[PDB]
Amino acid sequence: SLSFVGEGCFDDEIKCVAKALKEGKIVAIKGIGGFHLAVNALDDEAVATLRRRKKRYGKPFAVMMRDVEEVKKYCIVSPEEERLLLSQRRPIVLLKKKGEKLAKGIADDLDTLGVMLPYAPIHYLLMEEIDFPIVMTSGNVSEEPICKDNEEALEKLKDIADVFLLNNRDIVNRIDDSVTSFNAGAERII
Amino acid sequence: GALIEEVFADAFDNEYIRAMEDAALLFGNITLTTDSFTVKPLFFPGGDIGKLAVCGTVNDASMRGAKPLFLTAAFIIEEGFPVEDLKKIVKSMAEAAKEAGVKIVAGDTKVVEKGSVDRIFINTSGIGVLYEGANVSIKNAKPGDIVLISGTIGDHGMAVMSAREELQFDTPIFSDVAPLNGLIEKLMTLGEAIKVLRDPTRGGVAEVLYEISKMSGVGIKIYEEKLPVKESVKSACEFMGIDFLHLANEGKVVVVVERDYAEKALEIMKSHEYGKDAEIIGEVNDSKLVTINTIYGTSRIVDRP
Numbered sequence: 365s366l367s368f369v370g371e372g373c374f375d376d377e378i379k380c381v382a383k384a385l386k387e388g389k390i391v392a393i394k395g396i397g398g399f400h401l402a403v404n405a406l407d408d409e410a411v412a413t414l415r416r417r418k419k420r421y422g423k424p425f426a427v428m429m430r431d432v433e434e435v436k437k438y439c440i441v442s443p444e445e446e447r448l449l450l451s452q453r454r455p456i457v458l459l460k461k462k463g464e465k466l467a468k469g470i471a472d473d474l475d476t477l478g479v480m481l482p483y484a485p486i487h488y489l490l491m492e493e494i495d496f497p498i499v500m501t502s503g504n505v506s507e508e509p510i511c512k513d514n515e516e517a518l519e520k521l522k523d524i525a526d527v528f529l530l531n532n533r534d535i536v537n538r539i540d541d542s543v544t545s546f547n548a549g550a551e552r553i554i
Numbered sequence: 555g556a557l558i559e560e561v562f563a564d565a566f567d568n569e570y571i572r573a574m575e576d577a578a579l580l581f582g583n584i585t586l587t588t589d590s591f592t593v594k595p596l597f598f599p600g601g602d603i604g605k606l607a608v609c610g611t612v613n614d615a616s617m618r619g620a621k622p623l624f625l626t627a628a629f630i631i632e633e634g635f636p637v638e639d640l641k642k643i644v645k646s647m648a649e650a651a652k653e654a655g656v657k658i659v660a661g662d663t664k665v666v667e668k669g670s671v672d673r674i675f676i677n678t679s680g681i682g683v684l685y686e687g688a689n690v691s692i693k694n695a696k697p698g699d700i701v702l703i704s705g706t707i708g709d710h711g712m713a714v715m716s717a718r719e720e721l722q723f724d725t726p727i728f729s730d731v732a733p734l735n736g737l738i739e740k741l742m743t744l745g746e747a748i749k750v751l752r753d754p755t756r757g758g759v760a761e762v763l764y765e766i767s768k769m770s771g772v773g774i775k776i777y778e779e780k781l782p783v784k785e786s787v788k789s790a791c792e793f794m795g796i797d798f799l800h801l802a803n804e805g806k807v808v809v810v811v812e813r814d815y816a817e818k819a820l821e822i823m824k825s826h827e828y829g830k831d832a833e834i835i836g837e838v839n840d841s842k843l844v845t846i847n848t849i850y851g852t853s854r855i856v857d858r859p
């Protein structure tokens with residue numbers, strides 16, 4: 365089952381996360397391979413505070429969107445790219461932008477954006493409670509291995525995340541999101 | 555690739571050598587060290603080869619928790635080396651021994667053909683006597699111990715670099731050459747709580763920490779914000795992309811202590827003329843790794859010189 369740590373919240377744990385995102389807060393989410401950090405990808409202030417709180421990053425953020433239709437609004441998506449997005453492998457796919465429509469600080473001065481689709485039940489549930497794309501960056505200060513255990517995340521990400529979505533299933537082997545692309549007629553994994 | 559020290563370690567293999575201490579401990583209470591001094595230029599801001607030859611061996615002879623007392627001085631001199639430069643070197647040696655409260659009791663002088671040595675080399679050996687409950691060794695660090703440095707890092711290294719390679723800086727940099735046996739004497743008030751003492755010479759602070767790690771079988775974590783360094787050294791290194799952790803020091807000691815005695819060790823240093831810039835800089839880890847933390851908690855391994 366899920367747990368919500370941070371400030372008090374009456375609702376079910378997904379609804380709480382939706383509320384926190386809506387308010388421009390950083391949420392640390394326990395997924396399949398570890399923790400990730402999320403904000404509203406249309407909220408410049410929230411993206412700015414995450415940039416400040418990591419402070420040693422600079423790297424562009426990946427963004428999670430609800431479906432292919434939503435991606436086609438922000439990015440150019442060829443059929444092979446759509447196959448990579450929809451794949452059960454569920455990676456981040458690096459895609460060419462279609463005009464600046466996201467918040468500043470996501471992927472500035474770059475013509476590409478890393479987009480992923482939902483991959484765990486928690487994301488599908490989160491998507492029906494929000495109507496904006498979300499940053500989904502690794503759950504780490506700087507660039508070390510992402511956190512995997514609840515107590516490890518609560519300590520390491522204390523100065524980054526405002527709230528946490530935890531669960532009581534151990535991740536045994538931490539594993540990051542894949543990052544791939546399509547170019548020159550073949551998949552090119554990063 | 556000076557794997558000469560490997561040939562050395564194979565042939566003179568014994569308990570004393572395997573230990574890789576700053577000084578051998580003989581009969582249980584007396585200590586013995588030796589060092590050669592080949593610095594160019596012979597006269598540099600803040601010192602010369604003479605002051606260096608004494609201080610370095612006085613220091614090495616104390617690093618075991620000891621009062622240094624007696625020194626030997628060996629001189630290897632080029633035919634036609636200016637005698638007025640020699641009088642200056644010898645004078646500097648006399649002055650340093652006097653300040654250290656030490657005496658040069660034996661020696662040697664050899665003169666070699668012109669071109670068989672660049673001007674002058676000096677070797678010094680030292681004898682010291684251990685304080686009552688001294689137990690200082692590079693093997694003595696345990697996890698939980700605190701690491702201190704007696705003052706700013708990288709002075710000597712950058713000073714001779716600047717003079718030798720004619721590098722002009724916005725601020726002139728002086729060498730830190732000093733005898734530290736007085737400072738060590740005040741530290742040895744703490745007895746067994748003082749675990750490790752080493753001067754970060756060839757290879758700087760980085761190399762010492764690795765030597766502590768290897769021999770104690772531990773790791774060490776240091777803190778960027780806590781590292782003392784003169785602004786002149788900071789920007790000199792920042793201009794050339796150098797890590798001051800790799801530059802040599804000649805008036806500094808790295809100290810490892812018991813957790814509860816760290817505050818006392820800092821104040822003992824801060825109340826001594828060569829210890830005003832002392833800082834607690836790190837902690838002895840469980841990890842067999844040498845790591846440095848930046849502001850906010852970004853860990854990375856310290857690279858070896």
Ligand SMILES: [Mg+2]
Nearest residue numbers: 576614753755
């Ligand atoms: Mg030494």
